[PDB]
Amino acid sequence: VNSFSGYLKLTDNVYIKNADIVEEAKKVKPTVVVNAANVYLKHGGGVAGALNKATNNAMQVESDDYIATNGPLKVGGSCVLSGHNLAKHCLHVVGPNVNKGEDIQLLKSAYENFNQHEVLLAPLLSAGIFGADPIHSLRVCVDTVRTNVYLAVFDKNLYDKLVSSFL
Ligand SMILES: O=C1CCCN1Nc1cc(Nc2ccc3[nH]ncc3c2)ncn1
């Protein structure tokens, strides 16, 4: 039993809700919140911009030190950093950005990072400003993640379409 409330159950392990991931994180304080990161951990917009804003830019400060030490992430890769005031940990995961020409096959590799964590709050990878089809992202999530994932979808219209089209 966990504190996630109001989710629709899609499969044994995947749950979905129309919610602002920022507000959801502040309420549950999950062990892991997933960020829709880029390889430079530049949290300018989309989910990342919103999460970072909620940390008063502390996420960005921490991320800049991470990059200075380690260099950029790989597309499809991840790193674990602090969750600041939102969660114990933030799993920064880089899905492919279609608006940069990146290979959509890397979306499966991106979701594989979730399997290293028993329970996660997450957005749909490569959705929004990353330019992928969210219906496809949900399909890859369900077919790749085996741990317990609670998906937050900001747009109500999109949430309803994802549910109504789910196989
Ligand atoms: O819906 C999708 C599909 C893929 C990415 N994506 N976005 C989100 C957004 C979100 N929260 C949010 C929304 C608007 C905001 N403005 N300022 C802060 C802030 C926070 N929570 C979950 N997914």
Author numbering: 3 to 169
What does the paper say about this structure?
X-ray crystallography-based fragment screens have taken off in academic and industry settings. We identified previously published and new fragments manually modeled with multiple conformations (n = 20). We used these as a true positive dataset to determine if we could identify multiple fragment conformations in event maps using qFit-ligand.
We created a modified true positive dataset (n = 20) by removing all ‘B’ conformers and setting the ‘A’ conformer occupancy to 1.0. qFit-ligand was then run but with an event map, rather than a composite omit map. Following this scaling, we perform standard refinement and note that the sum of occupancy across ligand conformations is a refined variable that can be <1.
